[PDB]
Amino acid sequence: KPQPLNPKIIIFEQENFQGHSHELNGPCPNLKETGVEKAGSVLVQAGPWVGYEQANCKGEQFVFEKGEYPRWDSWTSSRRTDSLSSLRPIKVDSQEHKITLYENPNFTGKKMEVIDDDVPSFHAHGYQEKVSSVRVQSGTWVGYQYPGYRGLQYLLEKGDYKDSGDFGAPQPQVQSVRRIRDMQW
Amino acid sequence: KPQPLNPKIIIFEQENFQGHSHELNGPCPNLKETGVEKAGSVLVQAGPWVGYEQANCKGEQFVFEKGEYPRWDSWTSSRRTDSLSSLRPIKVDSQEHKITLYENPNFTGKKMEVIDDDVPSFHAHGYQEKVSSVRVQSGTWVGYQYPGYRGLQYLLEKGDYKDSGDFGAPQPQVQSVRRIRDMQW
Amino acid sequence: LNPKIIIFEQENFQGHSHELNGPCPNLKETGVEKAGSVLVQAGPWVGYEQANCKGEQFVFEKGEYPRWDSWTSSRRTDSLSSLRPIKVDSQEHKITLYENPNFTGKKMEVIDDDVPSFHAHGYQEKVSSVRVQSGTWVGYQYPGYRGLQYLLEKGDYKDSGDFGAPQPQVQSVRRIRDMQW
Amino acid sequence: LNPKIIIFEQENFQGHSHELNGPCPNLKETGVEKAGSVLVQAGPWVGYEQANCKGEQFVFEKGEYPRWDSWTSSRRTDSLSSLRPIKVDSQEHKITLYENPNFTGKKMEVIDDDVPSFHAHGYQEKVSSVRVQSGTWVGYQYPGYRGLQYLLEKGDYKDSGDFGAPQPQVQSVRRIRDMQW
Numbered sequence A, B: 001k002p003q004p005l006n007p008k009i010i011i012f013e014q015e016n017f018q019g020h021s022h023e024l025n026g027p028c029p030n031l032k033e034t035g036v037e038k039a040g041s042v043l044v045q046a047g048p049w050v051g052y053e054q055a056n057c058k059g060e061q062f063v064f065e066k067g068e069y070p071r072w073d074s075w076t077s078s079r080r081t082d083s084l085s086s087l088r089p090i091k092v093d094s095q096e097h098k099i100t101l102y103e104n105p106n107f108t109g110k111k112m113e114v115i116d117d118d119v120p121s122f123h124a125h126g127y128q129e130k131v132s133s134v135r136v137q138s139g140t141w142v143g144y145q146y147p148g149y150r151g152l153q154y155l156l157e158k159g160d161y162k163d164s165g166d167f168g169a170p171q172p173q174v175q176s177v178r179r180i181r182d183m184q185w
Numbered sequence C, D: 001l002n003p004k005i006i007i008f009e010q011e012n013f014q015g016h017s018h019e020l021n022g023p024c025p026n027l028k029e030t031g032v033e034k035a036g037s038v039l040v041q042a043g044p045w046v047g048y049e050q051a052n053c054k055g056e057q058f059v060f061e062k063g064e065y066p067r068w069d070s071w072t073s074s075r076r077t078d079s080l081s082s083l084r085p086i087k088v089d090s091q092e093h094k095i096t097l098y099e100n101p102n103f104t105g106k107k108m109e110v111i112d113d114d115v116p117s118f119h120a121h122g123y124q125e126k127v128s129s130v131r132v133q134s135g136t137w138v139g140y141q142y143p144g145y146r147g148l149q150y151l152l153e154k155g156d157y158k159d160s161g162d163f164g165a166p167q168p169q170v171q172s173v174r175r176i177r178d179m180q181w
Helices: none
Strands: A042-044 A049-052 A067-069 A086-089 A098-104 A108-115 A133-136 A140-143 A154-156 A159-161 B042-044 B049-052 B067-069 B086-089 B098-104 B108-115 B133-136 B140-143 B154-156 B159-161 C004-007 C018-020 C039-042 C094-098 C107-111 C129-140 C151-157 C172-175 D004-007 D018-020 D039-042 D094-098 D107-111 D129-140 D151-157 D172-175
Touching: A098 A140, B098 B140
Parallel strands: none
Antiparallel strands: A042 A067, A049 A086, A098 A108, A098 A133, A133 A159, A140 A154, B042 B067, B049 B086, B098 B108, B098 B133, B133 B159, B140 B154, C004 C018, C004 C039, C094 C107, C094 C129, C129 C151, C129 C172, D004 D018, D004 D039, D094 D107, D094 D129, D129 D151, D129 D172
């Protein structure tokens, strides 16, 4: 289906998602000046978002996340109800480290997208093709030449690498990947 | 393609996988009584396998894994050559913990297969359907009712569970999963 | 220590204190209906709505639950009827590097992860024994997995030789994860 | 400590010892052509075949490399021509729970993982401060994530109140992983 370019969330009316609801797509510090008045139920189609008990954002919050929230009890283990007054999307910080290898130079064709997780045989994660291009989004990676990080070593830090010509290889042969994980200087 | 029911590995002859090779599918404590004589190169189509320098299995081993091993230097960072004499498959011990949720009772239909990794919104790992069956292969899991492991709790230990009727739920509603990870008794 | 849970009388840990170290089907009548707290000193356990460990459930991990409002992210249950220690299927991959031989002095316990270099872990000593508890590992000579490989698998390695190490040098250890067949 | 590498004269750490704490383009001529060892006391660094840091590479992590046979899982290189400290992009998600207020005494550092219960981690004390370094976390009241939620995000929380805690109770912390939009 279509992939949202922003947070979504349809706080309802009759609970159980029955009837009469409004979709809010970004901060909304109140809820009367909303099609709705009292937080009926909640449907989250892309989050996460963080609530509040007191409009203008203060009070006992709650963290809603993709899924269905069928009724008041539903987003408060607290049994402390009096619904939804503030609704802000959580703009979550998340730290991944990605190197993405490419089939043919110029970063096109079949790729092998790896993250944090280190990989020894590219041949076993299903990639089989030669490796000619690479775009290092983050982390410090050290791509070997055979499986079990053995043979020829190549350092691969932040920056796209278009050819072995600029990523120091003879045969565009990287069987394995390793992430450097620690410094001490 | 077809999924092997056993280890594979075609130690070759002319290096670079050129010419004249033999496929070994299980322990083979020697290599003359092989189409081959001297470990030319190695192609592994399903491993891992562990070698040796001295037939009958003793000496300086090496661990080959899916991928191509183009020439002697290739599976020895040691530069200590004199090829392959013993070839045994590694029958690796690996410990995963799996709970696998099901769409319709009787463990059929759309499933959500989770491992070690805990999951909060099933709705966000792409599963959307109700949850009526479950087969707990391992680990100690505690499946909630909404996202963020909230609402109703269900314990789910080793054993298949055919209905809420036997897995204690009212509405076949498990939005989240959690693995118990530690004991202290 | 076997399971240790303390059922109290009322909120905020006041009054009636009792311990428990095993299952309990009708604790409700064993002398406990005033369940207005819960302390776990070792578990995890499980509570119930009804008794005989049947009914909507709850799980206790360890530490305080001042009011029923922790175990019932609601209130649609009954009053704590039964209890029961939980049995945890938790697998781990433990290798343990013994500096001296036959398990002595310096020691490195590795649990699931890959170690490109022992030095940075504080391990600067030789290696002579290796008693593998789970999983398939393979020990390198120098760090970064370069050098001599040493499959190390479920079992005991008596000496560096006892696992093909000419010299007792092993600076790296990494888990073998997959199985292709 | 800045990068610290010691280039030696010959095998097994014998002879000529030199330290290094920065890059070095032609160390080969700086007085070092007899590269028959390498000790890393802090890195990681990188070697080269040729000089100017150009040529087939190698990486040193920390601890001993008695003979060229570690850095060259071959021998198709030149003799150690340049060196250079490495810059590591390593992200972590650190939350740190300060027992007293304004950062004092007991403290819990959490790095990436989910903590269903602090008690089992040894943390049995209240909470009053929380200085979040990375990632989006959310603090529970009781353990198992039941109770009061507290988004805790990049920044400093001065007191339990300073992050909506009526009472300074927080037994669980779990990372928020996804972003849907």
